[PDB]
């Protein structure tokens, strides 16, 4: 359910959010860690989601991990920076949910349940399975199958989710995508 915020034609100071949190990871693909903050571009997109810091390996530019295929992805062509950080908990503004959840399996199960072809989400799109899934997964490896009507397209549409659980403190994942523009680079930091 990665919350998505898009910022257009606005000057900024990304440090204000980072200083409030305690950052543990800042990987910038195809760009320098501060190059995105130092140089200014057409638009900036920021995503925030309940993602465990512990699955650091699962979040990667290229990985065979479940999130890449189903939970979340970033455009390869555009430079992408991912921030793994932690709220101090001094602020009471952000409260905590039950437990972290991720989609381990999203696939085109056939009307037979023999041959299976996986459904891989592209960048910038919510998975088709997430519409069937709710907000949190109650039990480990919960699988949801929705009866499909001919108008829907028929066949079997299935979804699955897996338990992660959460520590006292909150671990969050941030996805940043930066777009260059011909002249409209107006989103910027005697």
């Amino acid at each position, epitope marked *: 359910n990665f919350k998505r915020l898009v910022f257009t034609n606005c000057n900024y100071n990304l440090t204000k959010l*980072l*200083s409030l949190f305690s*950052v543990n990871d*800042f990987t910038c693909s195809q760009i*320098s*860690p501060a190059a995105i903050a130092s140089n200014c571009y057409s638009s900036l997109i920021l995503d925030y989601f309940s993602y465990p810091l512990s699955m650091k390996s699962d979040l990667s530019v290229s990985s065979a991990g479940p999130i890449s295929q189903f939970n979340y992805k970033q455009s390869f062509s555009n430079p992408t920076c991912l921030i793994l950080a932690t709220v101090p908990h001094n602020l009471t503004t952000i409260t905590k949910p039950l437990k972290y959840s991720y989609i381990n399996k999203c696939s085109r199960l056939l009307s037979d349940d023999r041959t299976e072809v996986p459904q891989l989400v592209n960048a910038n799109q919510y998975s088709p399975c997430v519409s069937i899934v709710p907000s949190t997964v109650w039990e480990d490896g919960d699988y949801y199958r929705k009866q499909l009507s001919p108008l829907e397209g028929g066949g079997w549409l299935v979804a699955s989710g897996s338990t992660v659980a959460m520590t006292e403190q909150l671990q969050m994942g941030f996805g940043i995508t930066v777009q260059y523009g011909t002249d409209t680079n107006s989103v910027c930091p005697i």
Partner: antibody, heavy 127, light 109 residues
């Protein structure tokens, strides 16, 4: 060629407050990350407090958590480590190290190499 | 959650003798464990970074190899300048850079 200069040796009292300044040059101020470590005399090295100056984000060791506050001024390129409730155990030498500067060939803000070190300050605690 | 155990301290190696030191992480850092050489009474010096590559200007073919929790540091030829206290740093997920206890290196006689 990053350059680090640290304050002179300071003698203070337990329950006082200590402010040590780490000054840097020879590398982009926004790109470097300053990490504060304490070496107890005749003891294993320990790390207390890691701060990125431009982001201003601060992470502290669990043992020293809530006892050390680090503030960095980008304009003066000075990083200040503040410790209160001084104890006999605190007496030691303090080293600040700037990770390899990015803007060209890095993407974990540390990655290649990381740490250059400084002259260090010997803080002595006397009641 | 993170703790470091180093090779037995005070390894006994004479000059020209291979030195092997191994520090084990509590969990699977996998790709991040720099090796630091500390001269007594002075500032530390960088050695092998990520335990995969030598820092520019480090001679003597300092060799670091391994994966996950296990990491190793081998010096094929020992020199008087080489003898120093050696530490290892765990980085990435920078919630707590935990320096290793360290191993002293001394001439054997």
């Amino acid at each position: 060629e990053v350059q680090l200069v640290q304050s002179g040796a300071e003698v203070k009292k337990p329950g006082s407050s200590v402010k040590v300044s780490c000054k840097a040059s020879g590398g982009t101020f926004s790109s470097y990350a300053i990490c504060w470590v304490r070496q107890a005399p005749g003891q294993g090295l320990e790390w207390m407090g890691g701060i990125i100056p431009f982001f201003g984000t601060v992470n502290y060791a669990q043992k020293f958590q809530g006892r050390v506050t680090i503030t960095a001024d980008e304009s003066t390129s000075t990083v200040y480590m503040e410790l209160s409730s001084l104890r006999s155990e605190d007496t030691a030498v303090y080293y600040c190290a700037n990770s390899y500067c990015s803007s060209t060939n890095c993407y974990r803000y540390y990655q290649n190499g990381l740490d250059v070190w400084g002259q260090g300050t010997t803080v002595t605690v006397s009641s | 959650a993170i703790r470091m155990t180093q090779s037995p301290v005070t390894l006994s190696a004479s000059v020209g003798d291979r030195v092997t030191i191994t520090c084990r992480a509590s969990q699977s850092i996998s790709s991040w464990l720099a090796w630091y050489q500390q001269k007594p009474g002075k500032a530390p010096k960088l050695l092998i970074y990520k335990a995969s590559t030598l820092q520019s200007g480090v001679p003597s073919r300092f060799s670091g190899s391994g994966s996950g929790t296990e990491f190793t540091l081998t010096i094929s030829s020992l020199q008087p300048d080489d003898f120093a206290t050696y530490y290892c740093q765990q980085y990435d997920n920078y919630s707590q850079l935990t320096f290793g206890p360290g191993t002293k290196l001394e001439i054997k006689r």
